[PDB]
Amino acid sequence: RPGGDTIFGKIIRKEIPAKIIFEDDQCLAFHDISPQAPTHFLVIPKKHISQISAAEDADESLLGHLMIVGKKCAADLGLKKGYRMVVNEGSDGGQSVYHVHLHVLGGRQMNWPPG
Amino acid sequence: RPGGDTIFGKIIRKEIPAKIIFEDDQCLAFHDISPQAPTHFLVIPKKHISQISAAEDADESLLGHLMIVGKKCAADLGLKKGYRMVVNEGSDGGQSVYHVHLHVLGGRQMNWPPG
Ligand SMILES: Nc1nc2c(ncn2[C@@H]2O[C@H](COP(=O)(O)O)[C@@H](O)[C@H]2O)c(=O)[nH]1
Ligand SMILES: Nc1nc2c(ncn2[C@@H]2O[C@H](COP(=O)(O)O)[C@@H](O)[C@H]2O)c(=O)[nH]1
């Protein structure tokens, strides 16, 4: 559209508000509307990739970029005792938004199994 | 050493056995010794990076490569109803091995919060 037709596309295009933490030419990081920990944000690419199973070999750097941006935002938000990054794929993974996104949660002890 | 001084380095060097699923010039994927789901494997880089907070901007492609390899292995292992990818960082994240690794779990419904 550009950005995609999900709500994430609307956020990228600034059509609906979000608490934006950081943004560059490739991605955007913003807080989750339903935090599962004291700090819970998402890092999403500006390029619409619907699922991680649909990402191409060429999307490799982009995907790695979401993680580098995720670690920089986490440190800047003070998650110095650690955090957990999560990517959900499909029904079994619990994915609800069909635009690839990385979850970053911290501020409390994360338990195991990870769901 | 090369591979690092953790058990992951020993696995990479074939000094101790693991159920290896796939291997290329950059990484290795093998089954977790303590599965938290029917299918639970790890994708680790051959380059030792101790923590995701320690990864450099140059490790971006490598990190994205762990995810691409993770999705290809998941599909090859039949996780067609989906899966969840997880990266744990530090104490709060629950990290126990100081060699960056990506968890891929599937074969059952993954719940929320992710720990
Ligand atoms: N900031 C923000 N987060 C949203 C919105 N709609 C959905 N989310 C969050 O997006 C996440 C998508 O993750 P999923 O469930 O696909 O793994 C959920 O945690 C959900 O709370 C929204 O309008 N704004
Ligand atoms: N295949 C294999 N998995 C291991 C071994 N030692 C530790 N692990 C697994 O490595 C994972 C490390 O994840 P962490 O707890 O750091 O997030 C754990 O799930 C643990 O069960 C081993 O000797 N072989």
State how far Cα B86 lies from the chain centre. 8
Residue B18 bridge partners (DSSP): none
Give the amino acid at B94: G
Of A36, A62, A110, the CB nearest to B94: A110
CA distance B65 to B55: 14
Return the CATH class of domain B1-115.
Answer: alpha beta
For chain A, what are the domain ranges? 1-115
> What is the distance between the alpha carbons of residues B112 and A111, in angstroms, rounded to a whole number?
12
Tell me whether residue A101 is one of the annotated catalytic residues: yes
**In Å, what is the CA distance from A84 to each residue of A108, B12, B48, B101?**
10, 24, 19, 12
Q: Are A104 and B114 in contact (CB under 8 A)?
A: no
Q: Report the C-alpha gap between B85 and A11 in whole angstroms.
A: 24
Smallest Cβ distance to B67: which of A52, A79, A105? A52
Helix/strand number for chain A, H first, E second: 3, 5
Output the CA–CA distances (angstroms, integers) from residue A85 to A114, B7, B76, B77, B94, in the order listed.
Answer: 10, 22, 23, 23, 11
Asked, as a colleague might, if the bond just before A38 is cis with ω within 30 of 0, I would say no
Any atom of ligand 1 within 6 Å of the Cβ of A94? yes
Method: X-ray
Opening angle at CA A89, ends B92 and B12, nearest 5: 65
Angle at B82 between CA B65 and CA A55, to 5 degrees: 35
* Local structure of A29: helix, strand or coil: strand
Q: How many alpha carbons fall within 13 Å on the CB side of residue A18?
A: 25
Tokens, residue A103? 């979850």
Question: Which residue intervals of chain A are DSSP H helices?
Answer: 7-12, 60-76, 90-93
Distance between CA atoms of A24 and A103, rounded to whole angstroms? 18
Residues A82/B90, Cβ–Cβ less than 8 Å: yes
Angle between helices A60-76 and B60-76 (to 10 degrees): 120
Residue B2 neighbours by CB distance under 10 Å? 9
Residues whose CB is less than 8 angstroms from the CB of residue A66 and which lie 6 or more positions away in sequence, other chains included: A27, A43, A44, A45, A100, A102
Q: How far apart are CA B45 and CA B52, in angstroms?
A: 12
* Ligand 2 centroid – CA A87 distance (Å): 19
Residue A113 · residue B105 · CB < 8 Å: yes
Of A68, A62, A93, A58, residue with least CA distance to B100: A68
What is the 8-class DSSP label of residue A59? G
For B9, other C-beta atoms within 10 Å of its C-beta total 18
Cβ contact B98:B7 at 8 Å: no
Residues in chain B: 115
φ/ψ (deg, to 5) at A37: -160, 170
Distance of alpha carbon A105 from the chain centroid: 10
Contact A110, A37 (CB under 8 A): yes
- Tell me the three state secondary structure of residue B45: strand
> Which of B39, B23, B8 shows the shortest CA–CA distance to B103?
B39
